[model samples]
Target: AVRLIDLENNASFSKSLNSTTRSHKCTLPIWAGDGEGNVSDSVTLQDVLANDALVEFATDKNGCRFLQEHYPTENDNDVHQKLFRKLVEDRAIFLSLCSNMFGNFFVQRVLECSNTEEQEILTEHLATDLYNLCLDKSACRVIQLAIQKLDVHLATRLSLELRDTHLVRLSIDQNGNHVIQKIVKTLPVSSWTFLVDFFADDDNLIHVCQDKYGCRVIQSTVETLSTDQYAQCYQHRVILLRSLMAGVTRNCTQLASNEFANYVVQHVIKCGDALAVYRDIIIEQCLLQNLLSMSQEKYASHVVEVAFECAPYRLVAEMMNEIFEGYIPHPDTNRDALDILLFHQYGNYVVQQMIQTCVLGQNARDQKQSEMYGMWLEKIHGRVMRNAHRLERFSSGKKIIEALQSMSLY
Candidate 1:
């Protein structure tokens, strides 16, 4: 039995359970590229795969080709139809995933895209889309976001081009007749702020416009526009000039009449033999600085206003010349003290009156105005009353008043 079992055992091969249940799943890994030509492990594989699939489904080679073919030479509607057709051809799942993603990617590319020809085409299309979208109440956000994404320099170029077109329409009105006057009349104060801000640059364009077109425009619109328009413009000019003058004054010394006369005398002495040359140089420098400091617009307008309000004084110029010429008399001269005080007092009065009237908007009736005028005349009179005492000290207070009164011819 044992020998037989040995032979039988060889046929009895054992087999364990060989069947097993199994489950399987597959995933696509996503790849991300760093801006520096390197792959990034920071990005998850699933995210990369989703983006890749989305990009593949959204991108339209046909649309790109159509754009290249028709852009810059064709209307934007034609281009939009081609792109829409391409997007529609995509599967519903892909389209659903890519709608916003593709739109965002395209917008980002258009903004960052620097190709001159392509940018021109894209900008034209975008402008057309924006115009159409602006007409639609629901599309306002999209339109605004699209515009906000545009490059500023490119936007400026577009604005300038648009301005040129409108300007042509503006220029076409022969005899300068147009609805602009009516439009300006209806415009609100807030809208005028646009013009103010635009001209704030103080560029040559503003000056040129003022010298050429501005006067005519103002004349045409004067009756139609609000008085505040003119007032605002005038205020802007004054503010600009005031700022400039403040800056100049901070850097330079203003010479008083007495100090100026002393400077002239010193120069005269230095020139002993060539007094004319010295006097010419000193006077020229003084006048130049004064003229430079004077605000041309403000001074001219002031002169006009004063002339309109009061008669011109002929003695003013002559007295100013004498004062500038270092004509102060010596103390010991018989009429010296009297004449010196008279000239100084009269000159000071005229200058103060002119400054007040023109610069401060005061007239003869104003208390301060009358006081300045009275103070000047009284100073002359007081010196006259003390003539004998002044004569002993070589002062010309009396003679100066007499000379001023003679010039006044009142």
Candidate 2:
């Protein structure tokens, strides 16, 4: 005699059975609710199997034998269920702890390196540890969490470190080449700003030669001392500017032909009162123009060319245009209208000619598609907004110029 409950229908019944053969299948267990009639008081294999059929199926050698010999009592089944849940919870806790530890370790090692060589060594070691941790499939979540946290922390730390060490200086002397070499070797490119300032402050040619020669020699010496080292920073703009012009000619043939290139060169020469100031302004203006011009698709392509040739004059012109548009008062509204017409005509002419000369007619757009044109417009607008925001923070043209010039593209 046996009692069987139809858990799904909430029906109970008693039935007589002489012999039974059970079927075995790989399926998960389903727990019967109390509505099936509580079997909490019962202590039998059948009672346990009713609540956890999948486990019974998994452990059963044969379904018939399992039903007869291995089923748990209801009370015993409840205890096992409680224990199983605890095991899962504990495993989750352990995984979380391991992930946090690895993340902390990565940050400590990676952010502590004082030099590039040290950073490389630490990076290699950290990468290996992370790889090994990943191979343990169970720890995948932990590894992912660790990597995300580590990257964020490292980026923030590096940015802060760069800001703190933003300014650097080196004094060169022709007489003390060794000292200059030593200084150059010890100085990082990020630290060259202070050196630029020092150079700009001194006006005499003899003084300039002495300072640069000494600094370059010291930089060379420093390179010799280090396992991984770089050469001295450029001391003169002539060679650098020449190289820049050559690059421009190769990359932007159209701009090379324009009078704008010569105009930029002249502005750079005039605006930069001293050699050091010239270098500083050249670097700064180049960076600013590249950043700012990114908004104008037609103009954006020329950023690199503008940077190399004459960023200072171009940026000034752009700034002036912005000022005129926003703040400057026009005497006659009709004259202002004429000015807009002339500007638009000039721009259209330049853009049409530029496309014709550089691009093939097969690629020309008869009517611009909405989706592509809209995307291009949005990108340009966004770039302009960002450039405007960046420019607003600077108190003077000089400060902005210096910041850009100090940056090392390499």
Candidate 3:
């Protein structure tokens, strides 16, 4: 019964498709071949546009694929320009295509080939629902391209349409955050100060960074800071940077322990060259102060490893001193912290990362620092050796013993 109903529906659907194609005088066979230009040999650009089959071709997967490849090579304004007008002739149809898997590409190509006037038309339609479009998985991509291809003034105008609450909401959306990232990466910092200023607000900073999607925007924003040379750009970058550092410093332990926020912490640490002060501030205020607890945590342990790997040589030396001199030889238990870590599930990896760091840093550091790392390795190896029996009892413990033995650091 279900099959009979499906066949009836499919028959009616094909009947309409056939009538549409036949009336246009183009027999665009239902895209029978792979996206290998197999259909292009029989169908010419003139046939497609002349038949007014632009929307029909765009909505079909194989037809859309062919258009993307063949449309770009044409010299005449016949294909893409005509396609754009047809797409946006009605707002409903244009938006439908903007979210269509195959049709969206055609829309993007239109934006790519559109003139200033054409862009104004498209943006005029898109601007009103720009926030909703950003939240659409398919439409969000179009918004990103528009941001890239549109005139700076127009693009800025369109982006500014999404203000504080709207911008934050978009920044936290799975699809929308990508649009936010694109705006940050494509626009100069000065032009997007509205976005920067909004994101840098203390409440917004914490809210966004703790999110899975929004945190990526903060990282993207952080990544662009190094490229700003002009004072206009510099002011925005500094304000954003200071707010980020201040928030992370104030909420260092909490952010570090958060499942999603920890990545922001590691990113800030790894981008240390451009953000030296914040890097050291995070290491001192966040990781070092909360080193033991973070090293055992599921998320912050990764941040701790990044700090150990990326901190300045002097700061690294300080970390080593703290781990060895201050924390080891568990005062209450009388067992060495290193020995305790060798058997710990998460802490064991930090120990392994530390060993790797020491070995690699040997040649990278100066003679004095090089010897210090070697001494640290020897001390770590000594603890592992003493704990070998108990360390071999668990998988994590065995990994520590295996890691140390494989390096032969002793």
Candidate 4:
């Protein structure tokens, strides 16, 4: 087989080489026009390989495009194996392609098509640079693909490099954080205890929650632990939640108000039914004490929305009372906290959620609880109607008005 550079030197192959040199507009088959839609004039896959240019093509934008196109459609195992060996033939070349923007897709296609032996070879090469790969924008995606598509043992080998401090470090990075989220969701429960341990430090917990990227990883971790896939992971889940709960307990008030951290607070609130304790801690420790202010604050208001939406009847009633009766018994009058929230930009959302939550609760309660929510809904409807004209002043106010109208409380 002749080398691709030598093929480029051959005058007869100039047109075939033209397709390899220029970038392909369509990664997939698309109608371009007049049968010019696909790369009709492009070089044959065999001719490109006959020249031994698979590595060169796999690394170039157009070349990678051609290979990706041919590998999937042709469906010949020998052809795929040929391309796979060409890709992984050299360590440095393989790593470069894995991290290359165009080359990464070729690696991904190889991953997508790999059999047992192929995946093992690809994974063995990938393990050496797993950490750096996870941090690279293009390379991180390749790592995630390997983790999700490859077998568990190979995936574990890829993730095992993401140890204690490294886990937290990647957990906070823009590109790297995604890799951590993927691993937490893919790796078995035992593989991710470093996550629980990381949150064990209150400072680590707060810092991660505050970061835009890290907060997403925390959410993924919580979601994975809460799901039934890990039912046997109860003890591990309990410890993870305890560490998170303790950290959140200590910092709930502060975290709930933070721009990014508030999302973590709201997610914990969503788990109210998943683990009974979280809701109690969030409400009694974080939300109730700071209920009024948080209801009106920018970010914390979101937490209040989830809290009211998910909290049990007793806790929901407590929050409802705290917002309505606790402020100043008659919300109908002007200048009270409840009235102010009726008009508050952020707080109006909370009040609307309060109405929606109570309205929904009416269907799911005992007579006494039903009567309680009915009375509150009745009062809310009255307050909203009395201020309907003033409520019409803002879009948020109008939504609250609509919230009442949806329940036919007019």
Candidate 5:
């Protein structure tokens, strides 16, 4: 493979050969795809190079797939760059390509093979169309890839294209929320509040949490806030608090059991070491009082169950015990606490949670409160003075009743 000077040969050092070019042969297998009408009339890389055919397929679906598969390696003399150049030059075509299924994929692959300047070129077209382009499924994924693999600042800058109008709309949009989720997760923690800014109003963030897609974004937001100290996370804490219980202004139980927002409430509670510190918020407000005030409501009942499942056992046992002053089974109320929930449609979960937590906390096994536990179960089992029936109508209710019937024997 050497092209060294042949000093021993007579005409080895001649100048005439210096200006002549040499041909090199290949041993590796190669295939060509750029053809006009017939599959047999295959063209080579040099053919595309010579004929300038790369730009012709910038908008072609099959061509885009070809480009995605055959990624450009050579920095300068490649058709990938050439085709990308065509797209960038024609702003209309570039945006149109990004808006397609195959085209966005092509953009993603090329950007992976491209350098900073080229990535900058592709993203520059996109940074302004955050809302418009992300509305599409393919385009949203393209932007998300661009955010992660592109330059960090440039990635963050993509989010800048979305002001409040753009931000809010995307947060709850079915596919658009993904763009927002990626941005909030990828951006610095300092930029998080801006993502869910008006969450405290019970109108913006909490409202979104009840939404199918918005709940996902709010879930992401919860994990993001958990990265910092809970005490230092004032804004996040305020939003979470208001969202959970609707503060002094709203009915928090409404959010606790909802199909969508229930997951968000769980996320906030399960976040690292958060519940250990935040459990007091529920207790100080009187956990039993909160449950009773909400015990009548189906949605709020599940929230109580979630608390039982996620919190420390002894503490939750204490929540179960605070059933007097403001709780349901007082003389003035004549209402059965667990009794009402045991047969109720949704409250069954709360009943089950209470029994499980008591068993798990082993409060039922305690010699002291074991009597109290039996009495509580007796009331819920609809047993009169130690006599009861497993006659609950619903299956879930039947299960709890059976469990209590056996436990009362202890």
Candidate 6:
């Protein structure tokens, strides 16, 4: 029978999710509820209890709303006592329900609305579930909430169970990435090291730097390492340091255009200022020589901004020289160099990046640093003002004007 699919049989995304508790809300109680009498189609906590059919339908949208509205807060009350026992009886059944979209909401609310003791009971399988179900989108949301809010006691056991060599899809898998994002941000450095070592195997960090999820986790890893420096161990808070140190520098040209991968390129550069080991690698690979080409690309342009912000001072100066040589104003010709640059695509952003990048030293009272500031300002700003008229026609041209204004104090 080709009847109907019944896809939206009283279902929709409109069902609101809330966990704040109060005395029961249904105006009608006991036999006066929806199922007990055919008075209306509306559902309430009593209607959920009066008909087992309603509880079966509860895992979806309407049911999700019902639980939050009626979930038991008082163990002494008859309705709450029975509802509490049913939910707590089988942790696996409840945990298993966390995969469907609305089901995940219900599970998340369960952890939030249920008291701490109930939260402990519901999340008993936290490690194994995260280990076994990393790819389940809905489950990960619930797992994310549990670990972050309820303190679901996940780290120690999860580190042991989730440390699987085969757990590689998490880098790019649709649902798996969210779990890993939460994992990397939530777990300790030691645990992160173990997971990265186990999962990455012989995989290239360069290649992974482009992965949607892989890049995401990489971004977090560098972020943690970057923030953890100079900010920790307050005892040394007043100590003067030349630069901060970081790990991970790879060949980044392949990802220069990738929507996700290009960011790793940008992040490394911003972090590169304090990076100690990979100075020459970035210069030869991703910075100057690559900058010669990458600075103009639609996506790569964003990445190049990091070069302006984070690259070594000497590297930036030379990079600017390379830019200047390629786009020099013709001697004795009436042509405006900035006009030539604003129209030339690559010429446009190179001038743009130099002006914007140099201002990272907005306050350079230090003598040598002040020289660095003045040099970049002098190199690019004059062309910008002279070419101001051409800028009105193109957005990139306007950006140069903006960049010039940003450097006005210099």
* lDDT, candidate 6, 151-193, per-residue tens: 4244445545666534555656777667667766776555556
Per-candidate TM-scores read 0.23, 0.19, 0.78, 0.81, 0.71, 0.69
lDDT measured at residue 72 in model 5 versus the true structure, 0 to 100: 62
What TM-score does model 3 achieve against the real structure?
Answer: 0.78
- Higher-lDDT candidate among 1 and 4? 4
Question: 182-207 in candidate 2: lDDT tens per residue?
Answer: 22343433333233333232232123
Residues 1-410 of candidate 1 have per-residue lDDT tens digits of 35553332321122111111121211111133233323344643234222332233223332222223332333245443344333333344322322332343443333343344444544554454333223333333323333344454444333333232333223223222122232234343232333333323333112312323332332233222223335544464334323322222222222112222222223232332323333333334433234212212222222222221232223223223333333445557645322543344233233333333332322345665455444444554555556546443433333433444442312
Off by over 4 Å in 6: 1-57, 74-84, 88-92, 114-120, 126-132, 199-208, 229-248, 271-284, 325-342, 358-363, 366-376, 379-393, 398-410
lDDT of each: 0.33, 0.31, 0.75, 0.75, 0.60, 0.57
Q: After TM-score superposition, what is the CA distance of residue 49 in candidate 1 from its true location, in Å? A: 69
Candidate No. with top TM-score: 4
Q: What's the CA error at residue 306 for candidate 2, in Å?
A: 7.9
Alpha-carbon shift of residue 346 in model 6 (angstroms):
5.3
Q: What C-alpha lDDT does candidate 2 achieve relative to the native structure?
A: 0.31
4 or 5, which is superior by lDDT? 4
Q: Which model, 2 or 6, shows the larger lDDT?
A: 6
Candidate 5 residue-wise lDDT, 234-261, digit = tens: 5655455334333312423456657787
Higher lDDT: candidate 2 or 3? Answer: 3
Query: What does each candidate score in C-alpha RMSD?
Result: 25.7, 24.9, 9.3, 6.6, 10.8, 10.9
- Poorest 10 consecutive residues by lDDT, candidate 1: 14-23
Comparing 5 and 6 by lDDT, which wins?
5
Model 4 lDDT, full chain set: 0.75
Clashes of 2: 21
Residue 359 C-alpha lDDT in model 3: 79
Task: Between candidates 2 and 5, name the one with more favorable TM-score.
Answer: 5
